[PDB]
Symmetry: C3
Subunit: 225 residues, 3 copies
C-alpha cells in the first residue's frame, strides 16, 4: 500500500514556553516498511501571525498525491476512517465525537468536502479522516518537527535565540549536513525522518523536556557570546 | 505468587491490513520475577472462520490442573472480582453489563465448581494483570509459529500482532518482546521448526499505530 | 524557568502486592534542562499508619518551605485542574469538587499568604507537569532509601514504586529513572549508605501493569 499523509507541527514558544504560532505543514509519501518517508513537501506558516492548518494539510497532501498517485490519502482528523468527500452535516451527526467537534467539522466541511470530491472524481483516490490511528500521519508529524527545527536554524536572529516546541514525544539530532527526527516512543516501531540542511555557526542548541507539557520536547537555539 | 492467565491475540490480515480473524489463545503460568513464562498451552482458532473468553477460561483451567497456581487471571477488566461471584445482581453493581450478564450463565458456575474443587479463585482483572499481558505476547508468538507452519500451503501470510510487541526469529525458536519499556521487560520464547525457502519481515501496520505486522513469504 | 514541585509516592506492599501505606512526600527544585533536581526535601510518612488528604497538605508545606529557600518562579502541586492558582480556590471557581471545598479551607490561605509575601503562585497543574513527575521519581527513590534504612533484621520489605520507574543501587547512592522514554530521560539521584546483609531485586508488580516492585530480602 502507498499512502500520502499530511500534518502540521512545531511551534515557536516564548521563553516561558507559551505557544506563539505553528511552523510547518508537511505532506509525505509513505511506503513499506512504513517507518519513514523519502518523498515529501513542506509549507511554512508564519508563527508570528498565526483551522487554516487542516486546509494547508489537505491542499499539500493533494499536491503530493497528484505526483505520486497513492492508494489513499490520510488526513489528521480522528474520525474513524470516513471519506472526506462524504462529510456532510448528517454524516458528522452520526459520528461519536463532541458537540464542538461536530460543530468544528461542519464548518470545515465547506472547504474540505468539495476539495476531496473533486480530487476523487479525477483519480478515484479517497481522502480519509483517520487521524491518530495512522502511521503515515505520525511520520508527517515527525517531519513537521524536523522542518520546524530546520526553519529555526535558518531564521534565528543574529545574537538572538529561538524556542521550538516539537510535536509529541519526538527528538531531533543535529548532523553537519542534516537533521534527523525520531519518535521517542518505541511502541511505534521506530518511526523516523531525515532532512538535509546547512547548520549555521555561532549558535548552540539543546533538546530538553518542556517542563509545562509532559512528553513534549523543546529544541532551543541560543547565540554564542 | 504463582499465576495462570490467558489471552487471545494475533490476527491474519489481508493484503490491505484488514483483519480476518484471530489465531491463537494462550494460557501461561507466570511466577517471580513475572517477566516471562516457561510453562504454557496454546489453542489455535480458525482465523478464516472467526467467545475467545470461553476458550481462555478453559485453557487456563486446563493448565491450572497441571501446575496448581495460586490464582487465575481472566482477561476482563473488572477491578479484580471473583468470577464465581458474578451473578446478575453482583454484575449490576452498560452495554458491557448486558454482555457479561450473558456470559455469566456458563462462566460463573464453571468457576464455582473449580473453586470448590481446587480452592483457586478466577479473578476478572484484565488490563491490570502482567500475566495477562504475558499471555498476549505468547499469543503473538504462537501466531507467528502458526504462520511459519502454514506459509508453504498458503504462499504468503500477513499476521497482525498484539499491541506493541515484536518477534524475532532465531535458529530454533521464536522470541517475542513487548516494545513498551514501561511494562518492565516482558518477553516470551517458543522453540519451533523454521522451514527453509522463506523470507519474513516485521514492520508497522500503517493503519493501526503501535501495532506491528509479521509478514512471511515463500 | 525555575519551578518547585511536590508529590507523594512509594508504597509498602504486603506478600500479595496489596498496598499498605505511602512512604515519601518530596518537594523538588527543577531548573533547565528539566530532567532532574539537585535540591530537594523529603518528609516520610508512617506507611503502617496511613484518606489522601494528608499527602497534599504535606505536599504544599514542603513545597513552600523549599520555595522560601530557593525562590522559584512558580510552584506546581499534584492536582490536575488545568492550572488554576490555589490562592483563588473557593466555591465559585471550584464549582466551575466536594473534596476541594474541604481542602481549600486549609490550602487556599497558605497559598494566599505565600503569594502576598512573594508573588509566587501555587498552581494545581498535576499530570502535565514535568517537575511533578520528577518529584514523583524522587518519592520512589526516597522510598527505597527508607526501606533500606528501616528493613528489620532477617526481615524483608516490598516497595511499590510510582508508575513506570526503576531504581538502581550504587555503592553510595540510589538512582531513579523513568521507564518511559517519551518523558525525555527524567531521573533522580540521592546519596545514602547501603546496608550490608541484604539483597534486592526490581521486578514488575504482577497485579498492576507498568508499576515496578523493589524487594529487599535479608541474606542468611
Ligand atoms: Mg494534526
Ligand atoms: Mg484479551
Ligand atoms: Mg500525587
Amino acid at each position: 500500500m502507498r499512502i500520502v499523509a499530511a500534518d502540521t507541527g512545531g511551534a515557536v514558544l516564548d521563553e516561558s514556553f507559551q505557544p506563539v504560532g505553528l511552523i510547518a505543514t508537511v505532506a509525505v509519501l509513505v511506503e513499506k516498511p512504513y517507518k519513514t518517508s523519502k518523498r515529501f513537501l513542506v509549507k511554512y506558516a508564519d508563527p508570528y501571525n498565526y483551522r487554516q492548518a487542516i486546509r494547508d494539510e489537505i491542499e499539500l497532501a493533494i499536491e503530493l498525491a497528484r505526483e505520486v498517485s497513492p492508494d489513499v490519502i490520510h488526513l489528521d482528523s480522528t474520525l474513524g476512517g470516513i471519506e472526506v468527500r462524504k462529510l456532510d452535516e448528517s454524516t458528522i451527526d452520526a459520528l461519536q465525537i463532541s458537540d464542538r467537534g461536530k460543530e468544528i467539522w461542519k464548518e470545515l466541511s465547506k472547504d474540505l468536502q468539495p476539495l476531496a470530491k473533486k480530487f476523487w472524481e479525477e483519480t478515484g483516490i479517497e481522502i480519509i479522516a483517520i487521524g491518530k490511528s495512522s502511521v503515515p500521519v505520525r511520520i508527517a508529524e515527525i517531519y513537521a518537527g524536523i522542518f520546524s527545527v530546520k526553519w529555526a536554524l535558518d531564521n534565528v536572529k543574529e545574537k538572538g535565540g529561538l524556542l521550538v516546541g516539537l510535536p509529541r514525544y519526538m527528538e531531533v539530532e543535529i548532523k553537519k549536513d542534516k537533521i534527523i527526527g525520531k519518535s521517542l516512543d518505541p511502541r511505534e516501531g521506530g518511526l523516523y525522518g531525515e532532512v538535509k540542511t546547512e547548520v549555521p555557526q555561532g549558535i548552540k542548541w539543546e533538546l530538553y523536556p518542556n517542563p509545562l507539557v509532559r512528553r513534549f520536547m523543546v529544541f532551543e537555539i541560543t547565540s554564542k557570546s
